[PDB]
């Protein structure tokens, strides 16, 4: 899954295993985390949700 | 639809700098990571590096690692080549372009360094 | 690093256009690493027809195509007239910026 944001467009603001377009908007007007399911993560410290 | 609207074949000293401008006209700079390289004469480009959009910092090119520098006249989401280390072998053109679909989609202009007594 | 291990010239003709087989010096062909086909002139400006391995370009007649061909990058000065042909820089931008790789020359009739 991807975990977009919104900088220039909010399709930058992306959840998928599906892509798409941005323009005018790289790293600087986009954004991208890796946002997915199919895991119960049990005890994740360190590394907050 | 990036064109560098730039200046032309500037000239400098052994080792000292100048900046060569280019202005992003026609396409948006201001969210477009344009290339403002250098031009090793013979071959043709020279990746001296981009712009990014926002920000107006440049990435710089292995090779341009040394003469070319970045700066942002973001205004029109442009930038400006600076030149430090005017070199006895760095007489040689220079180029910008901006657009998207990770290549440059549009090669502007730059202008040729003349870097010599 | 890599190399466009192909045309560094092309051959375009009267009826014809000149479609370089930049092969692979730095792997397969690809829209990824962005193969185009950036034409120039006197004036020595390169300037995109077809680039990013599917994307044709602005201003641009029926005289390119841009993706990887043969085995490599493939740069079609394709449809080269008196209009229609150029010296074209290797597009290679693998996820980076399209710089120039080694180029076809594509001719035209005229």
């Known amino acids: 899954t991807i975990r977009y944001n919104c900088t220039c467009g909010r399709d930058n603001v992306g959840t998928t295993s599906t892509d798409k377009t941005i323009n005018t908007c790289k790293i600087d007007q986009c954004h991208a985390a890796v946002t997915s399911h199919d895991k119960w993560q049990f005890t994740s410290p360190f590394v907050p949700r | 639809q990036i064109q560098l609207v730039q200046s032309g074949r500037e000239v400098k000293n052994p080792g000292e700098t100048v900046k060569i401008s280019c202005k992003a006209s026609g396409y948006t700079f201001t969210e477009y990571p344009m290339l403002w390289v250098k031009q090793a004469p013979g071959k043709g480009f020279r990746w001296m590096g981009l712009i990014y959009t926002n920000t107006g910092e440049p990435t710089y090119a292995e090779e341009f690692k040394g003469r070319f520098v970045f700066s942002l006249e973001i205004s029109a989401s442009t930038a400006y080549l600076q030149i430090n280390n005017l070199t006895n072998e760095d007489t040689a053109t220079y180029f910008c372009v901006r657009d998207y679909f990770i290549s440059l989609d549009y090669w502007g202009q730059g202008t040729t360094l003349t870097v010599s007594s | 690093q890599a190399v466009v291990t192909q045309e560094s010239a092309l051959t375009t003709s009267p009826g014809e256009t000149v479609t370089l087989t930049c092969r692979s010096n730095?792997?397969?062909?690809?829209?990824?690493?962005?193969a185009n086909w950036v034409q120039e002139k006197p004036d020595h400006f390169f300037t995109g027809l077809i680039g990013?391995?599917?994307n044709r370009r602005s201003g641009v007649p029926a005289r390119f195509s841009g993706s990887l061909i043969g085995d490599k990058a493939a740069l079609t000065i394709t449809g080269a007239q008196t209009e229609d042909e150029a010296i074209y820089f290797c597009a290679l931008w693998y996820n980076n910026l399209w710089v120039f790789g080694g180029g076809t020359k594509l001719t035209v009739l005229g």
């Open positions: 730095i792997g397969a062909v690809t829209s990824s690493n962005c």
């Open positions: 990013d391995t599917n």
